[model samples]
Target: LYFQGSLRETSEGVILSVIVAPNARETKIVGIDGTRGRVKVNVAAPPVKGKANKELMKFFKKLFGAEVVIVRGETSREKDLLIKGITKKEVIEKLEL
Candidate 1:
């Protein structure tokens, strides 16, 4: 899933339009603007570490009560997330994007 929208920083949580990447073993944050702004996040653990991945899962779980997994694009930054028991609309609404 791919999302395009504005992002808001709030006292409650970070809110933004998100693209879901499923089946991926790691969680990362990437900036897609200019070359100078090409930022990426790689968990210290390997794909199977499940440590960093669990962090993302826990974040989403607390917010959405759904299971989320990264399936593709772990190294590329652009990613695909496998979200179980949730719909695209629900995800968007929750994020308010």
Candidate 2:
């Protein structure tokens, strides 16, 4: 797992690479353990009524310790997350991802 360039600078904050899988067995399946350029995450809830998206923001807030937001790909599985008050390399090392 090597997501060296997963971090990108955004106008508001940093963009984190993520791929979500809703309605999975648990909240964490693949993990941020690095799969080359994206954090792989799985959620137990289904992707309806914005349940999965909410779960994603909550997960990032608790895990990444920042104001997590989906700046793009709200409906798509692949997402670009905006982390307020953090940097790509800094957060990368801060979180055990």
Candidate 3:
């Protein structure tokens, strides 16, 4: 249950807590942040003009094949992502964490 702390299931879908590192070489899930209870993600887009946020959305959308949104922390590194039409178990499986 190490990664469960960062994932929550709701009536709508699953909510994922993430810490994003923008301007990386490629977009990928780095690992889990046990202390902060968040998933660490590296985005290839620059952290400007919402590019990183957009990239994150695209990554999640493609990865989960679901509708993803930034529910919170739109301008911060820490973010709460709402992924619709998917379960927490699916997220864990897809992310392989």
Candidate 4:
């Protein structure tokens, strides 16, 4: 699956793996990319001065209803986001991926 190692459960929360496409028409989850093994997302903000990254955090936090923090890959499209107080199953269900 493209989401291999993408979602992980930890004591703190779930770590969600994602890849972002900035400067899109709107911000939303685009589902998984089978070739990339990561959950694909699109942000309305362009990838400049962390606008896109900020958009991602806001989107995930609202979608998942949890506090989200970037665990890794801040400068790259691929990112590991830690969603506090959420489970992997809940995330899967919410994203419907």
Candidate 5:
């Protein structure tokens, strides 16, 4: 019951928002734990060469079993990812921190 809360939805899909910490010791998408309605993640990859973003999509692909159609905040630390074929309940369950 960690990440029972959720992000917003649009006509395209659910906008899964997050706050990211780059250049971490270990890379991880740390979910739940009440981070003010945002997914919290730490990445070992740097913010160069789109490495961090690629890692994030990998994490997304693994966790949600879907491709991120659109990603916001490539330059900013805060980000939003649009994922299809998933729901609020699925997110809450899959991202159980």
Candidate 6:
């Protein structure tokens, strides 16, 4: 999902809150761009050498109670994430997004 918001580190994992415009330069999430209700997250990492992508998965894995993979949009800050072994509803409820 395209999470346009802020990200924080939590005890269990990470917390994501939405934002209207994140000023994401060259960062983007692919495939999920056209999806309705896609979550937008603003990460602290910059879009350079896949640092943001790596951090995103690591953050989600801890927060979402599942393994997360960057299926696409590695170079871009916006990305398509593969949330393994979890449901969308669970994430929404947990994050309260």
True-vs-predicted CA distance for residue 85, candidate 6, Å: 0.6
Residue-level error in angstroms, candidate 6, position 60: 1.0
In candidate 3, position 75 carries an lDDT of 94
Question: Candidate 2, overall lDDT?
Answer: 0.78
Which parts of model 1 are misplaced by more than 4 Å? 1-48, 74-76
* lDDT of candidate model 5 versus the reference: 0.73
Q: Which ten residues in a row have the lowest lDDT in candidate 1?
A: 31-40
Clashing pairs in 4: 2-37
**Per-residue alpha-carbon lDDT of candidate 3 for residues 49-96, written as tens digits (9 for 90 to 100):** 999999999999999999999999999999999999799899889877
Give Cα distance to truth, residue 55, candidate 1, Å.
Answer: 0.8
Residue 46 lDDT, candidate 2, scale 0-100:
89
Strongest candidate by lDDT: 3
Full-model lDDT for every candidate: 0.46, 0.78, 0.93, 0.87, 0.73, 0.51
- Residue 16 displacement (Å), model 5: 1.1
Candidate 2 stretches with Cα past 4 Å from truth are: 29-36
Ranking the candidates on lDDT from highest down gives 3, 4, 2, 5, 6, 1
What's model 4's lDDT at 12?
Answer: 93
Candidates ranked, most accurate by TM-score first? 3, 4, 2, 5, 6, 1
User: Quick one: RMSD of model 2?
Assistant: 2.7
In the range 1-97, model 4's lDDT, one tens digit per residue, is 5344468889999998889999999998778877656788999998999999999999999999999999999999999899999988898888774
lDDT winner, 1 or 3: 3
lDDT, candidate 1, residue 39?
Answer: 22
> lDDT by residue for model 1 over 1-97, one digit each (tens)?
2233323333333333333333445555433333322223343344454554556556566656766655554443344455566665666576443
Clashes of each: 14, 0, 0, 1, 0, 16
At residue 51, give the lDDT of candidate 5.
89
